[PDB]
Swiss-Prot record:
It is found in: Virion; Host cytoplasm, Host cytoskeleton. This is Microtubule-associated protein VP5. The chain holds residues 145 to 288 of 728 of the full protein. Minor inner capsid component. Displays NTPase and RNA 5'-triphosphatase (RTPase) activities. May function as a cofactor of polymerase. Associates with microtubules and plays a role in the formation, structural organization and morphology of viral inclusions, where the assembly of cores and the replication of viral RNA occur. Belongs to the reoviridae microtubule-associated protein family. It comes from Aquareovirus C (isolate Golden shiner/USA/GSRV/1977).
Length: 144
RNA sequence: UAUAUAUAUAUAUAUAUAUAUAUAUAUAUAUAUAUAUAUAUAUAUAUAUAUAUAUAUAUA
């Protein structure tokens, strides 16, 4: 899409032309902000599940994750939480986080077909065998 | 009364000078616009040099 303003929503915003025309018409930080979009695209892959912060029409193949905790007050879309939750509630579309670990998805606890007794379910077994020599030998700000 | 000469005044004509007005041209100054050149600053691109990082190859 071709636009005449920076304040746009829904798609990555990049310059149509080389920077020489926009220079003077725009300033440094403004000219800087579009750089990732100037070469924006990256692929998306067809696995079993895909999480997303982008809302969508709740339906037979779309679910709302319920964590049973207060939202991020600073996160701009937290205001949508009530409307989304009630719509999911009235159609039984909430998913407790534990459901994600099962081989097949179902909203519920203590299902018949699964005893939910596996090392994957036991959160107490926190393990960190892998490594990448990364600068975060530990990130002491992240706490499980 | 007359003639001739000289001086002064007045009128008319012609020439020149000066002042004022109007038109035209040229020169100079000032302002504004446009173009070109040069200098300085900033941004972007390209080339070269130096430094640092990463990857790959070879040696120890």
């Amino acid at each position: 899409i071709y636009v005449r303003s920076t304040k746009v929503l829904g798609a990555p915003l990049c310059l149509a032309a080389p920077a020489k025309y926009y220079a003077g018409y725009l300033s440094t930080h403004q000219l800087d902000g579009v750089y990732p979009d100037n070469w924006a695209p990256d692929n998306f892959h067809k696995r079993e599940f895909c999480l997303t912060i982008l809302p969508s029409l709740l339906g037979p193949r779309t679910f709302l994750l319920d964590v049973d905790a207060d939202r991020d007050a600073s996160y701009p879309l937290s205001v949508l939480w009530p409307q989304l939750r009630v719509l999911a509630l009235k159609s039984r579309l909430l998913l407790p986080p534990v459901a994600l670990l099962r081989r097949v998805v179902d909203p519920g606890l203590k299902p018949t077909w699964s005893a939910d007794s596996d090392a994957a379910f036991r959160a107490l077994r926190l393990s960190r065998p892998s490594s990448a020599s990364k600068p975060t030998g530990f990130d002491f700000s992240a706490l499980p």
